[PDB]
């Protein structure tokens, strides 16, 4: 029951063409949409559409997103993919292949809460 607003701004056919094309142009990268979860009490990131090395781990990706967001040091942040916090040691390539949608994008939500949408 994940709701990514990005899917409302671009038609599916447009997204799928872009996802397939960017994967063909940069096979060592994965395209990722990173969006604040419903109800999250965190700011939005400056950017939503990312291109990520496939061998980067989830923990490294978290480091870089947690660094970029406008939070104080004490503030909490959690990621969700398909309603589930991803494993720190997984690669972004694995996470992408396991979870990308039919448009060839991976969708990651983030929240201050440990359960998506709370």
């Amino acid at each position: 029951s994940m709701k990514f607003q990005y899917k409302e701004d671009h038609p599916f056919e447009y997204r799928k063409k872009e996802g397939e094309k960017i994967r063909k142009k940069y096979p060592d990268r994965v395209p990722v949409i990173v969006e604040k979860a419903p109800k999250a009490r965190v700011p939005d990131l400056d950017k939503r559409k990312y291109l990520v090395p496939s061998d980067l781990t989830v923990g490294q990706f978290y480091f870089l997103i947690r660094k970029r967001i406008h939070l104080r040091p004490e503030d909490a942040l959690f990621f969700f993919v398909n309603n589930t916090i991803p494993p720190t040691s997984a690669t972004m390539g694995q996470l992408y292949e396991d979870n990308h949608e039919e448009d060839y994008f991976l969708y990651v939500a983030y929240s201050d809460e440990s359960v998506y949408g709370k």
């Binding site: 990312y50 980067l56 490294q60 990706f61 870089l64």
Partner: peptide, 9 residues
């Protein structure tokens, strides 16, 4: 790639 943001390199 123009509309994408590279992160993690």
């Amino acid at each position: 790639a123009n509309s994408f943001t590279l992160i993690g390199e």
